[PDB]
Write a protein that binds this ligand. Structure first.
Ligand SMILES: CO[C@H]1O[C@H](CO)[C@@H](O)[C@H](O[C@H]2O[C@H](CO)[C@@H](O)[C@H](O)[C@@H]2O)[C@@H]1O
Ligand SMILES: CO[C@H]1O[C@H](CO)[C@@H](O)[C@H](O[C@H]2O[C@H](CO)[C@@H](O)[C@H](O)[C@@H]2O)[C@@H]1O
Ligand SMILES: CO[C@H]1O[C@H](CO)[C@@H](O)[C@H](O[C@H]2O[C@H](CO)[C@@H](O)[C@H](O)[C@@H]2O)[C@@H]1O
Ligand SMILES: CO[C@H]1O[C@H](CO)[C@@H](O)[C@H](O[C@H]2O[C@H](CO)[C@@H](O)[C@H](O)[C@@H]2O)[C@@H]1O
Ligand SMILES: [Ca+2]
Ligand SMILES: [Ca+2]
Ligand SMILES: [Ca+2]
Ligand SMILES: [Ca+2]
Ligand SMILES: [Mn+2]
Ligand SMILES: [Mn+2]
Ligand SMILES: [Mn+2]
Ligand SMILES: [Mn+2]
Lengths: 237, 237, 237, 237
């Protein structure tokens, strides 16, 4: 039972489980039923960007998704991460396919985290920037169908030799080091994440989406968590 | 007529104009009557730290002030700086003495700004960190009784050779370069500021406070703006 | 008179003054006659990158120039900047043309400078990054024919609306803030600068070149320093 | 067998293995017999600071060690780390004792690493800054006698509750994630490291010294590498 917090980019509306009737981006606290969502004007074949920020002052997690020359989509939710997550965690990217599929490529990824402790008013921090992925990336923990090196890109779900996506796939990419996401004595604590992606699809119904997540350290892909579950949750409850 | 946005660290309660009956920190939009305030347990003779954050997404300006091993004071206010300030501004510190005084020493001052453009999705940034002040700081625009070099600190208001604070003093320090605080075509835009200070006062009634501020490029201390006016506003209206 | 240090991307060989018989990159210490040079494979029509570094430990100024998938040119010169420059400078870019011309487009520019003090061991620093140039770039001091905003790019030399480069042109762009490039009490001083350029010429002999420079605060384009002088030097001695 | 590059801060002169007759700082390349050294005015009881820098242009590894208001010791060596280390490494701190001892307290540690690629021309970075060490630092791998939490410092070697150091102690602290220290496609690669320490001793001859090292991923304290070997080398050959 992993504790999970995520920002999803749902490309397929699973109206059974509370997903609205269109692609959208949402926020997930311990469940695949997003506490808050927002219509996202998904664009197939185009490189997009997702920015996610959070800070220990407003105690608010927000995220923006956009494509060059187009309206951006925003989603925010008030959440006190101190009570939802353990102090040490790991951060990652995650995508899945089901009966429907799409490329779940990641062109770049950046993350910064700062803990400005009470005791000294001296910062603790971590930052990593990936604009190119080496075929043997030793600082990423690839889980599932996640591979690196193809064009300097991170391909989260299985894509064949033809450049075409495979159905029923799941992948996850985690930074090797555990991040100190919060501390009892911190004045301010914050994080900022960004990643550009390319969700291409040869059909008319792409699924299932990508998602930036923060989990307990030893998290692993929940068995059979493909499709609508986006490699994060064991059940749609 | 300057357009001013500031976060004051009001040490003296001027109940004439709206101040609450205790030291407080507050948010000022074009006026000295804080749109929002919060109780601050002002500690005389001790270093404090102040953090001001803001982001184009929640369009919210928060501020946290604190002392090592004590409670922090926080205040936030929802404000679209896009409709209050011009795109090009300058940032600075300001302080004032009136019938009552205090040293308005500034031990360090850091600032970051980023603009994540839409047309390109690439960042534009600025960052400066002063952990020491030379006696001839050429990147600071000193105004009023503001001086540098004394011990490596920035003395906003007049302090004699005796080290004692002087009444009816005003001082401001502005970073030489104009900051591009916002843009119409930007996806995300954020700034963060931090400074440590030392408000000492021989007596029992210190006044009048420090304030980080953003203003129009050619901002100049309003005439006779000492005391309650904290070198930022001409009138108490 | 001005005190100048520069890294030229000399595209036109001026044998009369010392320029070796081919396009090269060099290190100018107070003279257009480079103290050290290196053959450069100037590619007309391609975006290139230049990286300049220097630290107070090695007391060496190096530079690298490269194009995606190609041999990179390197140049280095041991120089003690303490005895060559004043402690406060200004940094900028400079191009020029003479009888022959080329576009001197600047797609991006970034710069970082740090000062780790002796008296305290706490760093002071400045960082600015430009990935887009607004039509009213208020934090750059434009000199000569230099214009911002055309396509988001910086044009150091005159360029027609057609896109054709023009002869006898001189331009510079300095960052607004004076940089504290070195201090006696500094344990370690260092600066890093990067910038991507596009030198497009319609003819066969491009000229005259781009330059990264550190100068005294009030530097300005010398009289008649077009062509082989690259907006930097008054004479050729 | 380990591949190790280090920068010792030899506090005990082991005249039998190549150590000069006095406290020094050295550059070790696959051996405890420093390729290059320089006298160090080791001050017992004061907080020092060490700064290591390297870049793939000069291919020169430099180190500076200083105390507040005291001369700095400098040492540099021309080494092409591409032919000495594997592309993926781990960086960490090490310290040791033997017949004589000292406390090897690290009050802060910082490290930055950049890779400006040739194929792409966009950087890959990693940065971590420790100003405080929690009692369960999950992003550091502790080996031997290294403990976190005591005061907020990292004791590389055994220290009793009294505060007195102990003989024949050994310990390291590596950063959890592997660093991509270099790549064949890299135009520029560089790293900068900084850490402050406090070497206190109750006697007249402290030993054996602290060291910043870069090793292959799976490195571990070699058997018997206490004393003169500083937890890095199996023998003294
Ligand atoms: C036609 O596909 C829809 O109906 C099918 C039969 O009822 C479902 O199996 C299918 O769900 C699966 O695919 C989606 C889209 O890829 C995925 O989100 C879901 O978790 C299942 O794997 C879909 O509803
Ligand atoms: C005891 O001082 C208070 O009462 C005085 C008489 O009513 C006021 O003049 C005085 O105001 C002045 O000092 C304060 C504190 O420094 C300052 O805020 C104000 O602008 C005046 O200079 C204060 O209210
Ligand atoms: C053919 O041009 C060469 O010879 C001419 C006659 O001697 C010179 O005028 C000319 O110099 C000018 O143009 C170059 C090329 O742009 C420039 O580097 C120089 O500063 C003059 O403007 C060149 O030597
Ligand atoms: C007085 O100790 C010196 O002489 C002893 C007898 O010859 C040695 O055992 C001793 O070596 C040990 O201590 C040093 C100092 O801590 C250490 O560097 C060495 O590896 C041994 O542990 C020292 O030479
Ligand atoms: Ca879905
Ligand atoms: Ca007041
Ligand atoms: Ca020339
Ligand atoms: Ca020794
Ligand atoms: Mn959903
Ligand atoms: Mn007030
Ligand atoms: Mn030349
Ligand atoms: Mn030695």
């Amino acid at each position: 039972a992993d504790t999970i917090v995520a920002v999803e980019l749902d490309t397929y509306p699973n109206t059974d489980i509370g997903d609205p009737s269109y692609p959208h981006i949402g926020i997930d606290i311990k469940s695949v039923r997003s506490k808050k969502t927002a219509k996202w004007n998904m664009q197939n074949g185009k490189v997009g960007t997702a920015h996610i920020i959070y800070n220990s002052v407003d105690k608010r997690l927000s995220a923006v998704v956009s494509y060059p020359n187009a309206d951006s989509a925003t989603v925010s939710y008030d959440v006190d991460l101190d009570n939802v997550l353990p102090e040490w965690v790991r951060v990652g990217l995650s995508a899945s396919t089901g009966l429907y599929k799409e490329t779940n490529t990641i062109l770049s990824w950046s993350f910064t985290s700062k803990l400005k402790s009470n005791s000294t008013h001296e910062t603790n921090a971590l930052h990593f920037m990936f604009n190119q992925f080496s075929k043997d990336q030793k600082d990423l923990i690839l889980q599932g169908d996640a591979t690196t090196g193809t064009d300097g890109n991170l391909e989260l779900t299985r894509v064949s030799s033809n450049g075409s996506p495979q159905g029923s796939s799941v992948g996850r990419a985690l930074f090797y080091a555990p991040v100190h996401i919060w501390e009892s004595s911190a004045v301010v604590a914050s994080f900022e994440a960004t990643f550009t992606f390319l969700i291409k699809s040869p059909d008319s119904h792409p699924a299932d989406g990508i998602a930036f997540f923060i989990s307990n350290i030893d998290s692993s892909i929940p068995s059979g968590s493909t499709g609508r579950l986006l490699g994060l949750f064991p059940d749609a409850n």
